Amino acid sequence: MDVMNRLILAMDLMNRDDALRVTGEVREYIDTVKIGYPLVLSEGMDIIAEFRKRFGCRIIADFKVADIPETNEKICRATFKAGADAIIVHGFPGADSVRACLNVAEEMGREVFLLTEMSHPGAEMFIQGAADEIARMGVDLGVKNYVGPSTRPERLSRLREIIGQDSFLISPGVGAQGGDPGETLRFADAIIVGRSIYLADNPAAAAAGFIESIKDL
Amino acid sequence: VMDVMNRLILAMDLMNRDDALRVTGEVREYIDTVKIGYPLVLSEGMDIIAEFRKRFGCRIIADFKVADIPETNEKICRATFKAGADAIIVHGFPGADSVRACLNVAEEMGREVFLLTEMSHPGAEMFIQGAADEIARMGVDLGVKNYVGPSTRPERLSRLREIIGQDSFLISPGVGAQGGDPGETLRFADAIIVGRSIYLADNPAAAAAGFIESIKDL
């Protein structure tokens, strides 16, 4: 995957008008938008096709898929039907649940991103202790795309070590949650940025600023 | 606790509105509580919750296995309750802050959180099972009153019931298609969740009636 400016917009605004306006304002800086449940549950899955019609951007569906294999398959099918190019899947529910997603992705053209360790404080309770093993499971399953935490660069670096330089790694927690853009890009291929752009007084200036920060990367 | 008719919750995972509405209507004399998840919601929109309420008397549990950071969890819960869900199911594995975010929204909006502890599928043994007793204990500490645990592992469901206490409410999937037994599961769970064994049946009403006959003494 080739992400313009190594910057993925996390579009978690919850109304269509604002979400479309803000995305339009920063469109020159990106070609990849992560759309999650806050927007989809507020405005419907039709929002994905609309983003493609308006912006001709890549769409990552951040649905943190975390069900049994049978249900995971249905979720992936519905999601790719809506025009998502990729979907984010939790590793914690185990290999069969990940494989179900990989199967559908193969069938419909698309990519699976495996979420290993999460960026928020609560990730330390259960996820962190499992995260290296989750990454190894991804490697065993042939997963090529991964998500790991900007807020813990040593954990992100370890994730990169496990999956190797050939795998693709994106990383949230930049800005609002405390992660640094430049440091994150030592290890990740792209950074995910939500609030620091979409809640900014001037989202365009915010996006430009991030790119300035990582300009020599 | 919610008064689940016949201790039986329909897992409505059909992916088109017409079939989902048909099947739910056919079993409505037997079931007043319907679990709606992402297969249906991502196919037909959140307004499907409204359509179910309009057509049927039914309580709606949104099985969204919420598993994000606290800030995103709050948004998901808000959107879900705005749409009319009585309750939402949240994963415990992302930790206490993520669960608390959901509880806080549920409290403000006058709705309920169900905490998913251990899962019913084989993959659950890899990571979830080893954390599940602690996830459940965490739920109790956080004041969670409603839980989900696996019919496919009676020993684990029994332990989960111990941890949460007799006063907590416990619902359990994996009955039928995944191999769990209705009666055995009701030793520990307040209600069983049944999907495919009802919604793929030639006569879903007959299938529901059959489940109820098998648990009539309970």
Ligand SMILES: O=c1cc(O)n([C@@H]2O[C@H](COP(=O)(O)O)[C@@H](O)[C@H]2O)c(=O)[nH]1
């Ligand atoms: O470990 C993780 C995985 C996520 O996808 N995300 C998500 O990435 C985004 C972060 O946005 P923000 O920059 O506003 O903190 C959100 O959409 C959120 O759900 C996260 O913050 N940490």
Ligand SMILES: O=c1cc(O)n([C@@H]2O[C@H](COP(=O)(O)O)[C@@H](O)[C@H]2O)c(=O)[nH]1
């Ligand atoms: O541990 C779990 C938690 C779930 O919510 N569920 C879910 O409960 C249902 C099971 O349906 P079924 O009876 O067809 O196997 C599905 O909606 C599924 O996603 C599960 O099977 N095991």
